[PDB]
Design a protein around this ligand. Sequence first.
Ligand code: TTP
Ligand code: TTP
Length: 288
Amino acid sequence: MKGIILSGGSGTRLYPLTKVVSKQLLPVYDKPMVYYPLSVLMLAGIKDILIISTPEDTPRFEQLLGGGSELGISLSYAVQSSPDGLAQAFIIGEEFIGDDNVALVLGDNIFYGHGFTELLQRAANRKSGATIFGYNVKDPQRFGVVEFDEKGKVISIEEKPEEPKSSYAVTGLYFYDNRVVDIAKNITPSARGELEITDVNKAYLELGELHVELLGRGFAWLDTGTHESLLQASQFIETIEKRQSLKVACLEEIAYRMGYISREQLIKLAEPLMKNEYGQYLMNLAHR
Ligand SMILES: Cc1cn([C@H]2C[C@H](O)[C@@H](COP(=O)(O)OP(=O)(O)OP(=O)(O)O)O2)c(=O)[nH]c1=O
Ligand SMILES: Cc1cn([C@H]2C[C@H](O)[C@@H](COP(=O)(O)OP(=O)(O)OP(=O)(O)O)O2)c(=O)[nH]c1=O
């Protein structure tokens, strides 16, 4: 399975922080926002990843993250000229995807919880159908909404319904089989001028293979949409990290724990960073 991080958009609510740059370049506590969804693709076992952003921001992502080699993965880059919808990721990414399965994660989504790595690897290892991830939120009408029965079978999925049929938002992480490319090429813009991921997911519902993994109350799916929520998200990460000795979405750590790089390679990443706490964390990990 390949992975795409869709990381453009407008971030207009965050102005002036986004006057020049895209929101996913901004900090969430101690690392750029985009580290968090990239870490999720990596934990899923995905090592070939395309990052899509605006014409002006795609090079900024590339200057931050590089080509992947030092994390033992492959990062590629492509441009989305206008934010004409999430489903456009599969069109821009058609060549990249080829005949493979592909996961899509949004560059501003932050997932954290016990047992998540197992759920990701399960989804990434499926060879047919779509997996989406549902989360109980206060205001479901603001989101794609997934309705399911007592057995966990999807009944419906609607984009910002007037009268939400459940409390479960569909989060910005999706795993698809290769049918997604031609599905995306065949949907049409919604009223709001967007090629909708909800329409992609409707197509898999109709195909009888839309699977939902319900993230329970013990999971965190953090909002980065406003100044207030961004700050809350930062405080959340700080609190987890302070108590334990452990960082959330430390890319180099994940690359080592996933076996993408060796202990020797980790040591070599840590060395030039030894003046700061991040490098020291990496070296402590190498030492144990
Ligand atoms: C619709 C769309 C979203 N996005 C991404 C960017 C983010 O990672 C995520 C959210 O983007 P948006 O859907 O643009 O929402 P926003 O919160 O960035 O904008 P605003 O504050 O102005 O309401 O989806 C794209 O990259 N391209 C697109 O075509
Ligand atoms: C291993 C690892 C996990 N994570 C994230 C993924 C999940 O959101 C969260 C928990 O990771 P998991 O791998 O799900 O670990 P866990 O809490 O299940 O504990 P264990 O399996 O050790 O009993 O931490 C990182 O950010 N970096 C990492 O190196």
